Amino acid sequence: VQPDRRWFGNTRVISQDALQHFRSALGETQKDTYQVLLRRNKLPMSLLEEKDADESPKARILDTESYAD
Amino acid sequence: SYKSDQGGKRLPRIELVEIGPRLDFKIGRIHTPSPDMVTEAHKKPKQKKNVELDIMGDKLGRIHMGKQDLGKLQTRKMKGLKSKFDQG
Amino acid sequence: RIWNELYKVIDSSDVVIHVLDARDPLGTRCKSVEEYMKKETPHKHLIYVLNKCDLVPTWVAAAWVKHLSKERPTLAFHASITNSFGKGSLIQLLRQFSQLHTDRKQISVGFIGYPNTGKSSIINTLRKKKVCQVAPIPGETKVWQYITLMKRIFLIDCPGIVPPSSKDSEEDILFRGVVRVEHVTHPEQYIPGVLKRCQVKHLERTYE
Amino acid sequence: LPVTVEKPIPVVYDLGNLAAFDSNVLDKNDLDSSNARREEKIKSLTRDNVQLLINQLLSLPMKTTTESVGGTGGQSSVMTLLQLPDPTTDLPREKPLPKAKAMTKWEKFAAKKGIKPKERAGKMIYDEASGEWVPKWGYKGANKKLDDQWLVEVIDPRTLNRAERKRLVKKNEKQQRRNMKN
Amino acid sequence: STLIPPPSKKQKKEAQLPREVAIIPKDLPNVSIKFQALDTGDNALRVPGAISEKQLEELLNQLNGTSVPYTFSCTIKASDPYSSLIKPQITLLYTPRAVFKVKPVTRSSSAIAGHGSTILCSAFAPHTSSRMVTGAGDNTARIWDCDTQTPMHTLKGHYNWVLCVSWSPDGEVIATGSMDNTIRLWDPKSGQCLGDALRGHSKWITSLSWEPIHLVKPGSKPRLASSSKDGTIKIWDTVSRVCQYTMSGHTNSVSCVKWGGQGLLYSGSHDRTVRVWDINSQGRCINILKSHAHWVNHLSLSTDYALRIGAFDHTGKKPSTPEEAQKKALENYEKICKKNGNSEEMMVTASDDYTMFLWNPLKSTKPIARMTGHQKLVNHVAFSPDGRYIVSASFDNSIKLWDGRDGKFISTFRGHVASVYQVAWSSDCRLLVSCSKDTTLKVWDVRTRKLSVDLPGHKDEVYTVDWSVDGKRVCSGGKDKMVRLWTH
Amino acid sequence: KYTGEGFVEKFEDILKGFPNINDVHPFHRDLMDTLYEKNHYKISLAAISRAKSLVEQVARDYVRLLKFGQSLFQCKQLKRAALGRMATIVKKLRDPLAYL
RNA sequence: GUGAUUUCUGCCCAGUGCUCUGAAUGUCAAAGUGAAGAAAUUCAACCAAGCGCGGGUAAACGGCGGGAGUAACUAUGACU
Numbered sequence A: 001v002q003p004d005r006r007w008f009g010n011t012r013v014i015s016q017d018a019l020q021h022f023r024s025a026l027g028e029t030q031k032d033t034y035q036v037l038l039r040r041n042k043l044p045m046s047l048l049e050e051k052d053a054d055e056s057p058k059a060r061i062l063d064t065e066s067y068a069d
Numbered sequence B: 001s002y003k004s005d006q007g008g009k010r011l012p013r014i015e016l017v018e019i020g021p022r023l024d025f026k027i028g029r030i031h032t033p034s035p036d037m038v039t040e041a042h043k044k045p046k047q048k049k050n051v052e053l054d055i056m057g058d059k060l061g062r063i064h065m066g067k068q069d070l071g072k073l074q075t076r077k078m079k080g081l082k083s084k085f086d087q088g
Numbered sequence C: 001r002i003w004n005e006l007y008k009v010i011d012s013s014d015v016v017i018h019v020l021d022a023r024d025p026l027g028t029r030c031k032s033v034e035e036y037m038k039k040e041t042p043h044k045h046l047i048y049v050l051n052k053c054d055l056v057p058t059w060v061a062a063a064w065v066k067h068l069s070k071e072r073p074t075l076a077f078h079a080s081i082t083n084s085f086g087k088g089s090l091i092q093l094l095r096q097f098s099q100l101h102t103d104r105k106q107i108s109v110g111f112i113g114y115p116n117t118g119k120s121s122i123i124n125t126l127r128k129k130k131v132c133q134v135a136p137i138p139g140e141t142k143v144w145q146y147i148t149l150m151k152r153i154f155l156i157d158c159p160g161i162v163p164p165s166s167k168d169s170e171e172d173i174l175f176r177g178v179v180r181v182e183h184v185t186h187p188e189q190y191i192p193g194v195l196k197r198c199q200v201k202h203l204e205r206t207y208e
Numbered sequence D: 001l002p003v004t005v006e007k008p009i010p011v012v013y014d015l016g017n018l019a020a021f022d023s024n025v026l027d028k029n030d031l032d033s034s035n036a037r038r039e040e041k042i043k044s045l046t047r048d049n050v051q052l053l054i055n056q057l058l059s060l061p062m063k064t065t066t067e068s069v070g071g072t073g074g075q076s077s078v079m080t081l082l083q084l085p086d087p088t089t090d091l092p093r094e095k096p097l098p099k100a101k102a103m104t105k106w107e108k109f110a111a112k113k114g115i116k117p118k119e120r121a122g123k124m125i126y127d128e129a130s131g132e133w134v135p136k137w138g139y140k141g142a143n144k145k146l147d148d149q150w151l152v153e154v155i156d157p158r159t160l161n162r163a164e165r166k167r168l169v170k171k172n173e174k175q176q177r178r179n180m181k182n
Numbered sequence E: 001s002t003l004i005p006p007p008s009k010k011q012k013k014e015a016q017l018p019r020e021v022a023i024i025p026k027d028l029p030n031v032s033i034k035f036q037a038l039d040t041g042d043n044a045l046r047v048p049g050a051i052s053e054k055q056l057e058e059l060l061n062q063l064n065g066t067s068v069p070y071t072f073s074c075t076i077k078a079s080d081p082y083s084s085l086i087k088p089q090i091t092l093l094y095t096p097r098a099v100f101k102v103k104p105v106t107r108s109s110s111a112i113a114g115h116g117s118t119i120l121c122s123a124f125a126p127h128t129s130s131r132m133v134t135g136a137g138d139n140t141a142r143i144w145d146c147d148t149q150t151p152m153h154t155l156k157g158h159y160n161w162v163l164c165v166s167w168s169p170d171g172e173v174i175a176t177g178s179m180d181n182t183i184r185l186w187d188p189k190s191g192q193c194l195g196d197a198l199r200g201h202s203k204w205i206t207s208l209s210w211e212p213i214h215l216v217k218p219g220s221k222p223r224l225a226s227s228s229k230d231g232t233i234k235i236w237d238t239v240s241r242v243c244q245y246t247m248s249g250h251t252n253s254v255s256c257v258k259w260g261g262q263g264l265l266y267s268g269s270h271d272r273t274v275r276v277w278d279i280n281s282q283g284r285c286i287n288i289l290k291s292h293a294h295w296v297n298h299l300s301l302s303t304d305y306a307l308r309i310g311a312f313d314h315t316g317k318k319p320s321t322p323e324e325a326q327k328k329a330l331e332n333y334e335k336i337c338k339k340n341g342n343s344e345e346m347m348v349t350a351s352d353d354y355t356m357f358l359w360n361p362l363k364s365t366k367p368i369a370r371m372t373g374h375q376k377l378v379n380h381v382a383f384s385p386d387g388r389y390i391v392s393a394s395f396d397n398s399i400k401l402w403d404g405r406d407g408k409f410i411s412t413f414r415g416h417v418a419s420v421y422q423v424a425w426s427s428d429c430r431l432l433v434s435c436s437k438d439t440t441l442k443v444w445d446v447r448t449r450k451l452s453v454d455l456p457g458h459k460d461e462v463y464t465v466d467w468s469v470d471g472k473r474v475c476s477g478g479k480d481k482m483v484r485l486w487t488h
Numbered sequence F: 001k002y003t004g005e006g007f008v009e010k011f012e013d014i015l016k017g018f019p020n021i022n023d024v025h026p027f028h029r030d031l032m033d034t035l036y037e038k039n040h041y042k043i044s045l046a047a048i049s050r051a052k053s054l055v056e057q058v059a060r061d062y063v064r065l066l067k068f069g070q071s072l073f074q075c076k077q078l079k080r081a082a083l084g085r086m087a088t089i090v091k092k093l094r095d096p097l098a099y100l
Numbered sequence G: 001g002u003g004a005u006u007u008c009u010g011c012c013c014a015g016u017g018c019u020c021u022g023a024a025u026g027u028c029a030a031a032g033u034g035a036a037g038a039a040a041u042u043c044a045a046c047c048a049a050g051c052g053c054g055g056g057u058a059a060a061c062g063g064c065g066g067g068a069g070u071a072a073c074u075a076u077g078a079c080u
């Protein structure tokens, strides 16, 4: 493997305007039962998920009283 | 442009001022384009049915089910649906 | 041995059709794999075909197509070779699916469902000759089989599956025809179910 | 005071050029070269048009951003810009469209059979003794190595090698000229 | 980079038609509207139509008898301020504006060099934005002339890190709580060691707090309050430099110390319990509140903004005598606090169980509400200067905005990609800046719950953020050993 | 396969022996609550139940991997990898197995 | 070719697919006849073959999304 300046270069940046646009365009789906998918347009999907919840999951009790306490 | 008060802060009332020049023009001789050159000078550089690109990317396609008339399809004449074998 | 044919057909097939029984479709539905195809293979299409439609009234069949067409396309069929119903509707929809993938050199469509629903009979009526073996006994087709039509679309039939639901009966599998009734041991303990499902008026006219 | 004004025939717009096209009725005996009230008519029959045009321009979609100064592209967060549609009037080009499709006989030979193009990955090779990556052509290219070798092991052979390279270079240039003449 | 999908063909052919210019037609078919305030006022039956939204303001001024500004809204359904009929008898709700506009903070001034280690804490002077203090990972603090972007008056005198700096609420002295358990005071204009290092704690100092000016004896100076990892809460008078009297209620480390408007210190600790001390009772805790499940970090009061400046309003003036000073400070506190006429200061708690609690420790010992919805620990919480908005930051990259009166949920501010370490309000309670574990700082516009600007320029994490009092500058700094000032 | 069954069977006897503090009787429930800390009691058993599924998935995957091996070396390495991941799943239960 | 009988109007109101008693004024390379004005230019008429006109054919090579608009002339159906 030769040395090169690619490899140590960023490849897939994205900006805040695109992030906000795509995130706002995931609560307007309106699925059609007669449209089928052909391609999916690879996107960073772990940044556009996470609709708001109301739960706030349980806290870890093991960090205060382990078991010998 | 000045404040209007008839159209809110969006649309103002505008005013013009004449700066220059100020010319008149009368027609002289002309030389008109030939048909071939006219058809060769209006060219768009060249840079899909049922296929659409959604927002988010998402190349999608329509499938267009037909019309389905079940007025055909004579249902099978099973023996229990024939009243001839009625046990009375 | 057959769940290894299922995933192989799903892998090789561009478009899947899930076949149901017009008598009771919600029992033969076999959801259980649509969650899979949705999670791991979203680029596959999965339409419904509801055949054996000449064994139910016409309003029943229309109602079932309507109530099923709120998830997938769900065409309605009747598979004989000479006298069929729906062959043109299926052909002129496979032609659409083939035009959409106009740069793939061929498309494959796979038939899946419970046993004894008519997967082989649909291929036979589409092609108009006896291509794959059909028989009233459940376990007829055992391995997958390729079959060509139109030079650009292949059809694949496979054996019929029953998802291993750890509930819901031992005597429901019987009445969704899966078991070869020659092997159940005391077959007289199941007749109350037949009396419950059917009508007295209908049962009185067939024996007589 | 009114930001609006009515005209019988509706003005046509080209927002892609910021242009209006009015086709209402003029008065031949108003704009004559000697009429006193000439400017007070021109400047107003054009001012109503400009009013309609600003009304139309101040209602387009706006494009905001969240960047800041230094942004290599353009606008920052404190600039709203109007998204202008495309022009419609067919205005002629100035040069014809570019098309030059010659096959040069290599694109014919390579395509009769199945010679595909190369991946065009990199320019370096690996020299074995020494232990460097020694551009194949681009700095002391592996070609120009028999030139400064400290012995060749058979007229000077290195100069003959240079001549044999130059012959192929000139042949390639001649082939190119011939293809371009075809 | 990743691109927004391009517009289609039919959309391009659509975008050329004539398009939708509004006209404000006539337009006074008059609707009877109900002018009603937020607190209690419903003041009284007027029937206007489509009139100037700045004339509604004048209506209210001449009606309530002052000619002030008023913001408006309707039908608290989507609760949005002819614009009431373009989309669709109708009521009207209003709030006072106290107009003092703060332009956003967009650009970036010079990246000031400085210490030789990371920068831990930073604070702005309460009287002018021209000076500003930073304590850093070396054994020193520094003062910066923000007027010319230059250093000044480095304050040597510790021998371990400086973990918190505070500028007294009169602009007279600065206090530096350090790692070595000393506490030192310094003169702004000179830079000399004002005495020796106060001490008495066995482990490091976590937080400091000052006596609010509207309670200090005129002719005297405010006092201190110091938290320490050992668990003690110590008081200090800055003339005799004597430990007045300590408090030793908690058992684990204590995180933060406050000082209320009636003389009630509040303190949350790593013992999952919030205690309410007292100063008129020589320092015996009168209330213990145990509601959280994990330990507590960064308690925060409802008036901790007004209590931070003490008669130095947004106009940069000064007092000449404690007589006028005390009246100005009382006026400030009443302007901020008096929304029913009582001392209705509330408290908000932030703990490692993802949930915050809304206390009114005076009226009762029960929480008014339990604010919940985060998914990781909540590191920081803050009240609006006018007290009717709570903002909370958390290690799950989000920020949440709650209605600060009863504790409802309003909105979420997404946009960071790493943990949010702290947040900060502006003077007019309309913007909000925030710093994060990744580089960028972000400015949010609360009036619409969106992102206004996103400013990078640091190179490593960012630990502090401080907006000025008159909104002129924003200071930040962190792991890259540079100070940074952002302006408009 | 044999070691997989071994660990799974050592865990089943723990998951089927303890008395399921929820839905027994609101007297014994509260007594065991004041005696063993119901939270920790349920947490340790959920830890063991989770390990029981992790081990089974590891065993299931590495058999499928082995059936494509082409030499004694590679097959042996896959065996050791599987047993090591099992051992490392188990060695994290030092605290729950000591409380239980 | 098929394989008793009974079923077998099959995805083709597909006419450029497997043929021609039938055709046309839809077009039409280049050629040739008419007009303007000094002339390049522009326009009228005549037109070889394929493509729109149509009959016809049943195990039937291989070839295919349907229904409208009836070209605001197209650079091999650039469309809607």
Ligand SMILES: Nc1nc2c(ncn2[C@@H]2O[C@H](COP(=O)(O)OP(=O)(O)OP(=O)(O)O)[C@@H](O)[C@H]2O)c(=O)[nH]1
Pocket (backbone or CB within 6 Å): B076, C051, C052, C053, C054, C055, C077, C078, C079, C080, C114, C115, C116, C117, C118, C119, C120, C121, C122, C132, C133, C134, C135, C136, C137, C138, C139, C140, C141, C157, C158, C159, C160
């Ligand atoms: N009444 C009626 N019976 C049908 C219809 N279609 C198929 N059948 C009967 O149902 C049985 C279907 O057998 P198959 O076509 O092999 O069904 P399958 O078991 O899903 O197909 P395999 O993949 O070969 O196993 C046959 O005995 C047919 O006689 C129908 O449309 N109507």
Ligand SMILES: [Mg+2]
Pocket (backbone or CB within 6 Å): C115, C116, C117, C137, C138, C139, C140, C141, C160
């Ligand atoms: Mg079968």
